Amino acid sequence: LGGLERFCSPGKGRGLRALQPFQVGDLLFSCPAYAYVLTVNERGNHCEYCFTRKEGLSKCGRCKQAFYCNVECQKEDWPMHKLECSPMVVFGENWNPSETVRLTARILAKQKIHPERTPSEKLLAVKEFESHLDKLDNEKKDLIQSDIAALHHFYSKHLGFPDNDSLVVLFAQVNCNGFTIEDEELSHLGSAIFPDVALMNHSCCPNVIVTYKGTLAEVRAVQEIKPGEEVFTSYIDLLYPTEDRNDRLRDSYFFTCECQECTTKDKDKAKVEIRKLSDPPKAEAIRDMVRYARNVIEEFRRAKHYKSPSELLEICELSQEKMSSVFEDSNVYMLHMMYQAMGVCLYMQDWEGALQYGQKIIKPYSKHYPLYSLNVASMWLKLGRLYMGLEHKAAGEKALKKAIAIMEVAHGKDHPYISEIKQEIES
Ligand SMILES: C[S@@+](CC[C@H](N)C(=O)[O-])C[C@H]1O[C@@H](n2cnc3c(N)ncnc32)[C@H](O)[C@@H]1O
Ligand SMILES: [Zn+2]
Ligand SMILES: [Zn+2]
Ligand SMILES: [Zn+2]
Secondary structure, eight states, X not given: OTTEEEEEOTTSSEXXXXXXXXXXXXXXXXXXXXXXXXXXGGBTTBOTTTOOBOTTOEEOTTTSXXXXXXXXXXXXXXXXXXXXXXXXXXXXXXXXXXXXXHHHHHHHHHHHHOOSOOTTXXXXXXXXXXXXXXXXXXXXXXXXXXXXXXXXXXXXXTOOOOOHHHHHHHHHHHXXXXXXXXOTTOOEEEEEEOHHHHTOEEOSSOSEEEEEETTEEEEEESSOBOTTOBOEEOOSOTTSOHHHHHHHHHHHHSOOOOSHHHHHOTXXXXXXXXXXXXXXXXXXXXXXXXXXXXXXXXXXXXXXTTSOHHHHHHHXXXXXXXXXXXXXXXXXXXXXXXXXXXXXXXXTTOHHHHHHHHHHHHHHHHHHSOSSOHHHHHHHHHHHHHHHHTTOHHHHHHHHHHHHHHHHHHTOTTOHHHHHHHHHHOO
C-alpha cells in the first residue's frame, strides 16, 4: 500500500492515513478476499468462486447446491467448497449454519492452507483484528456460543477446531471486522474478510467508498484526501439521524462517532422533516412518532421471515399513513418504509408499483446521502432498469446515466458494472 501507512489514531485504535494526495475517484488500494462465502439465497445466480452473475451456471454434481462459471471456477473453489459439499448431502434439510459460521469455517480453512501472511494482510493481519472481547454482554456471548456449536456440528469432518476461547475471539473478530459484499443494486451477495480494508476507521462523512469487483475489494476517494489525513469509510447506512447511526455504532462496533456530521447534527432536522400544517405538531408528539417509527422499523425487520408479500406491503402502507399525520414524505422514517415497500414490489415482480415507490424515494435520497453514495447510485439504477422494462426509454436512459456518473467515481470508469449498464442503454 505505497502511499498510505498504518498509525495509532487517538481514541480510535489503529487506522490508515495518507502520505500523498488522492483526488476524487482515485484508487487508493485494492485487497483480494482473504476468505469469502456466497450467500445461500444467491446460489445458482452467481458463481460461488468469482461471484460473476450468469444464467445457466454449472452445478456441483455431488451436492447440487453450488454453481460455477465453468470447470476452472469449480476446481478453484474446491478447497473451500469441500467444507460444505458432503455435509449438505449428509444433513439435507437440516444443514443450516449461519453465514457468520460459514465464513468463519473458511477463515479456519485458509489459516490451515496458508499460515503465512497473505497479500491481503500487508498492513493488518487477521490474527491482529480487534475483537472487543471484554465488551460482549451475555446476549452476544450466547450468540457466539450458538455459532461455535453450529461450527462444530456442521464442519467436524473437514476442519480442525481451535479451543473454545480461541473461537470466541475469532467470531468476535469476524463481528468487528467482517464485510458484506453487495451487487450493483446493493443486493446482498455474501460475506468476506478483507484484512487491509478492515484497518480503516469509520466516519459519517467518509472520504472513501469500498466497492467490489467480483471478490476483490477496491477503495476509492469520494473526497479530496491530503497527506496526514486519516482515511475513513462509513460502516453504516448514512441515511439516518445522528442518534440512530450512533446506536448502531455502539451496538455493533462499541464506539461513538465524533465526526463533523455527528458533532454538528447539521443534517438531522431535514432527515426528520415535520409537516408544516399551520398548527405545528408539538415536541412530545414529534418525540412519540420518532419512537414509533424506530419500533416499526425493528418490527418489520423480523416480520419478513413469516409474512406473505401482500402482508408486508400492507404494513408498509399502514405505517406510512400513520406517520404521514406528522412526517413529510422526505422524512427518513417515511423513506425507510417506502424503500421496504419497493423491495416487496420487486420480489412480487410488480414493476409499476416498484417504480412509483422509487420515484418518491430518489429526490430525498439525493438530499440526505453524501455526494457520492452507493445508496443513491443503486436507486438510480433500479429506477432506470424499471423504466427500461416498461419501455420508457428516455426516462430510463436518464436514470441509468445518473447511476453511471456516481459509479464512475466510486467503482472506477472501467468497472464491469458500468460497461453492463452502458450496454443496457445501447439496447
Ligand atoms: C474494522 S475495525 C477498524 C480498525 C481498528 N481501529 C483497529 O485498530 O484494528 C472497527 C473498530 O475500530 C474502532 N473505530 C473505528 N472507527 C472509530 C471511530 N471513528 N472512533 C472511535 N473508534 C473507532 C472501533 O473500536 C471499531 O470497533
Ligand atoms: Zn466463476
Ligand atoms: Zn458440492
Ligand atoms: Zn459520525
